[PDB]
Nucleic acid binder design. Structure first.
Lengths: 124, 56, 185, 141, 262
RNA sequence: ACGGGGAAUCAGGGUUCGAUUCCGGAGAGGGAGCCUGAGAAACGGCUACCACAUCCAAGGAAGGCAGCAGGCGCGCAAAUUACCCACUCCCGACCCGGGGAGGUAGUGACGAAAAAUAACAAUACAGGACUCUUUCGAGGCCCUGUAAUUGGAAUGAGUCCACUUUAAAUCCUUUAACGAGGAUCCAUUGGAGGGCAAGUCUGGUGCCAGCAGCCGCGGUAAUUCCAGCUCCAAUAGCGUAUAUUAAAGUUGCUGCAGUUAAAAAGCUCGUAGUUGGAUCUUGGGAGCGGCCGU
């Protein structure tokens, strides 16, 4: 008994997307997961679920309505070229580096001690 | 000076154990009963008004 | 530097005399009448009026047909007429002064639950709001100080996730179903 | 005022400024002789080391021993009589203790019976003298 | 500071950008360019705050670096380029052209124009220079240096440049009765005929401009931009036609757009 | 004493504060001198001297947290050696890199907003409208109050699958399933002579101990102590110390006083200062809504 009503629609022909504000009606149940959202957009605006990035929801007080933002892309190549690497990383198609900035900062300053090619022969 | 009998009376006053008390209503409920005690209960009594802690 | 506001104000002013016998008299009656919780609940309405009222005092002392006085005049009236306090035909900025604290507490949603008959007492009406049983235009209002508007007055009814409206029973009755058939077989 | 003339701002202002010094609450605040003499140095509270326990005689109408403490401050090395409040609180105060000392109420004037005792003891060894009285804490020894 | 300023604080940022309070400490400091720090509008603000083609700061970068945005006919990849008054922003891929004219309030009117109108623009001349071989020069409000001008062009006039060549076609000479966009002060975005040029030696000349409704005001000579001969403009005006209805009048026409609309 | 935008109190005036996130200035332990550069008298640049302190194989070398964390000291007085460039933006040769700038969590009763701690029945029973009855009493259409009398409705605090959140989370929101009768899942803090809302209550103490801002209380009936009970006030807060504002028309411009309460120089002259007599354009015209206003 979930119903998605998209709203405040817009077309970026300069980012290759159809961007709108998704207004979801899910009365008497939990905040609907992003997976259930995209698959309803998929057979509403006639696209593969591959190219739909739904994010940043805000559940209304009372508990039968969420209004978040969604963007639907032309291609998967365009989906990756012009997108934050965290929203890509939710679908597993961007795998960020694992070591923290505190590791890199000491490694930057330890390299800065040595003059020449033999910088890399000190740390790790 | 005579610092010998310092804390004399608090030391020697015969201690009465504090009585078991049914827990008071707090917030609006304390304030609700306080409205009922002053403006709906008592009849306009003959003489001068007796205080909340009127004992004689 | 931080991307923050810091902008805040006090909404109540404490009385100059802490133990006026005749002030305690009135303010404790206004609690029992409209089912408030403390004197702070009273004092902030006394302050919202004394704000509204102070604006009206300033406009009355301006020149007649001053563009500020005419524009700011109609807004202060519309602000009061919408919330359903001052009359729609007596919307004149002199009648703003001839106006009192009970005219606002009548428009408090705690009272408007009780004065619509879907509560039994005003102290019960606060329970029905604080335990999210009601709504205003399919929006669950948890807070009894929801100052109701005129067009938004006739849309106050029960919630749909509550037994008092058209919804599921709570916890106490749902532990009786565990014991009702639990003891039978 | 007296001189009312439209071009008399410098006399009315300079008169008001000159005659403001004849106020007690002004000249006390705006000459730093009060602040130089104030043992707290403008501070609300101050910590200090208990070095003896004085039994101060009250004023003539009320005859009783007010059990005070001679305190020496950490910041000044200035010596102070501080009134230990309550019935038996002095018992919780021993020689060489970092007691927190506040004023008594009258902003540096001696209060009631106690002659020339302007200060009181608030805490004893970072433990409140109210908590020791109520029995909600004990003196760490 | 002991050198030039490179940061702009969101609070010290000018009001007519209408950047909010709570999103970040900093505002986009305009790169130097043809327009003044205050009197401009950065590309970043036009591309996500006004038009909302972008959402975040990287999104503004990942639009302009494909060279889709084309400020007055010559492409800028600079997100903090000062796109100021009369500048003809051309988004060619979406096929939308924008002249940056002021609204009758502070902000720049997001005004859509015909692609024929996106070929020329209007420039107020700032001074006449005489070059190094008796070559006369103009300087414009948008830093455009044109040489061999028409000798009848003076230095409070406006000229009609072409984006393709960078040369004058026609001009509006500063006379009385000619239109006037007020491009500064309390009257930012008013349109109306010039009725009195009042001369002050040493100090600044005030000029009295009458609106279409006879809503007469005055502005200093610095803040005048003549946009037509008589009551006829050379450009496309924003909706409302820079007439400036008052707050009494703005309320009646706001509520009738809710009353009769429902 | 960094200045200003401002802040607190505020009838009308004012009075006080402004180290503090925005603007401008200044300085990087104290001074001073310079190099490079468009821009520095730069200090996460240099060179000196002074103070301070570091490693040393004793020859020398190295330093600058009024950056973010943290430590020590000083004190009445103030937070994590956390996460992150995703946001805001800035810098670079740059769509790609970097940023303790900034953002996000932690600590946080500095403070500000919202707002639980029950609700409604039943019966005992005690009132008041009311037919009645002199009263006593009953009816009860209207309900009115409160009990370790009972009753079934509630929703939250919390434990907490999962989503949402977000750079990743947390929290909020959303939602399952649980989760309240001495609903022990128990609200404090100050008070109760007067000022000032609230006990001529009991028990102890006997000018003692203590209270008490002030006036006062305590001398054996204590409305003031020490306790018990009851009660009052504000309430998730409330007391205390101190700075400050109103109160203070007790600084008086608004607006005070000066015979006797504090106060008019012993007297006159006198320059700045302040303050200064009356007097110079009015009379008509000419149209306007009902002698009249324009």
């Amino acid at each position: 008994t979930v119903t998605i009503r998209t709203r405040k629609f817009m077309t970026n022909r300069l980012l290759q997307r159809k961007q709108m504000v998704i207004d979801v009606l899910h009365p008497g149940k939990a905040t609907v997961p992003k997976t259930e959202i995209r698959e309803k957009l998929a057979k509403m605006y006639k696209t593969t679920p591959d190219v739909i990035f739904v994010f940043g929801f805000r559940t209304h007080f009372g508990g039968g309505k969420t209004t978040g933002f969604g963007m639907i892309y032309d291609s998967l190549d365009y989906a990756k070229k012009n997108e934050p690497k965290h929203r890509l990383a939710r679908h597993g198609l961007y795998e960020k580096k694992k070591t923290s900035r505190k590791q890199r900062k000491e490694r930057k300053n330890r390299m800065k001690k040595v003059r020449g090619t033999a910088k890399a022969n000190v740390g790790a | 000076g005579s610092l010998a009998r310092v804390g004399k009376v608090r030391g020697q006053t015969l201690k009465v154990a504090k009585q078991e008390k049914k827990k008071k209503r707090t917030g609006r409920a304390k304030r609700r009963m306080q409205y009922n005690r002053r403006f709906v209960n008592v009849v306009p009594t003959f003489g001068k008004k007796k205080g909340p802690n009127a004992n004689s | 530097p931080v991307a923050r506001s810091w902008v805040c104000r006090k909404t109540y002013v404490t009385p100059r005399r802490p133990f006026e016998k005749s002030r305690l008299d009135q303010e404790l009656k206004l609690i029992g009448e409209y089912g408030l919780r403390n004197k702070r609940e009273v004092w902030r309405v006394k302050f919202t009026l004394a704000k509204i009222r102070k604006a009206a005092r300033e406009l009355l002392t301006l020149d007649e047909k001053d563009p500020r006085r005419l524009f700011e005049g109609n807004a202060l009236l519309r602000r009061l007429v919408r919330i359903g306090v001052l009359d729609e035909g007596k919307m004149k900025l002199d009648y703003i002064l001839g106006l009192k604290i009970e005219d606002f507490l009548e428009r408090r949603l705690q009272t408007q639950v009780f004065k619509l008959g879907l509560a039994k007492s005003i102290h019960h009406a606060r329970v029905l709001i604080r335990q999210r049983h009601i709504r205003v235009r399919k929006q669950v209002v948890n807070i009894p100080s929801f100052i109701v508007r005129l067009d938004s007055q006739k849309h106050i009814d029960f919630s749909l996730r509550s037994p008092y409206g058209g919804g599921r029973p709570g916890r106490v009755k749902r532990k009786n179903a565990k014991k009702g058939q639990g003891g039978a077989g | 005022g007296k001189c009312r003339g439209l071009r008399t701002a410098r006399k009315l202002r300079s008169h008001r400024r000159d005659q403001k010094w004849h106020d007690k609450q002004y000249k006390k605040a705006h000459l730093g002789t009060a602040l130089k003499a104030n043992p707290f140095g403008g501070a609300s509270h101050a910590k200090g080391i208990v070095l003896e326990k004085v039994g101060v005689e009250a004023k003539q109408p009320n005859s009783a021993i007010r059990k005070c403490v001679r305190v020496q401050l950490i910041k000044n090395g200035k010596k102070i009589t501080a009134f230990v409040p309550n019935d038996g609180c002095l018992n919780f105060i021993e020689e060489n203790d970092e007691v927190l000392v506040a004023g008594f109420g009258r902003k540096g004037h001696a209060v009631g019976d106690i002659p020339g005792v302007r200060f009181k003891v608030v805490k004893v060894a970072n433990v409140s003298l109210l908590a020791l009285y109520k029995g909600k804490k004990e003196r760490p020894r | 500071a002991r050198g030039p300023k490179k940061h702009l604080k969101r609070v010290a940022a000018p009001k007519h950008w209408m950047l909010d309070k709570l999103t970040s400490v900093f505002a986009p400091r305009p790169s130097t360019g043809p327009h003044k720090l205050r009197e401009c509008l950065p590309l970043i603000i036009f591309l996500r705050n006004k038009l909302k083609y972008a959402l975040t700061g990287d999104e503004v970068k990942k639009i302009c670096m494909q060279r889709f945005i084309k400020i007055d006919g010559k492409v800028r990849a600079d997100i903090t380029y000062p796109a100021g008054f009369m500048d003809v922003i051309s988004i060619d891929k979406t096929g939308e052209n924008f002249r940056l004219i002021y609204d009758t309030k502070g902000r720049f009117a997001v005004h859509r124009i015909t692609p024929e109108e996106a070929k020329y623009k209007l420039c107020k001349v700032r001074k006449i220079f005489v070059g190094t071989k008796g070559i006369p020069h103009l300087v414009t409000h948008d830093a455009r240096t044109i040489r061999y001008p028409d000798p009848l062009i003076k230095m409070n006039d406006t000229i009609q440049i072409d984006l393709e060549t960078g040369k004058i076609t026609d001009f509006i000479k500063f006379d009385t009765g000619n239109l006037c966009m007020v491009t500064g002060g309390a009257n930012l975005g008013r349109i109306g005929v010039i009725t009195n040029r009042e001369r002050h030696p040493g100090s600044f000349d005030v000029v009295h401009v009458k609106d279409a409704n006879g809503n007469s005001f005055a502005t200093r000579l610095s803040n005048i931009f003549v946009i037509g001969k008589g009551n006829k403009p050379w450009i496309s005006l924003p909706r409302g036609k820079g007439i400036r209805l008052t707050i009494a009048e703005e309320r009646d026409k706001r509520l009738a757009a809710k009353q009769s609309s429902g």
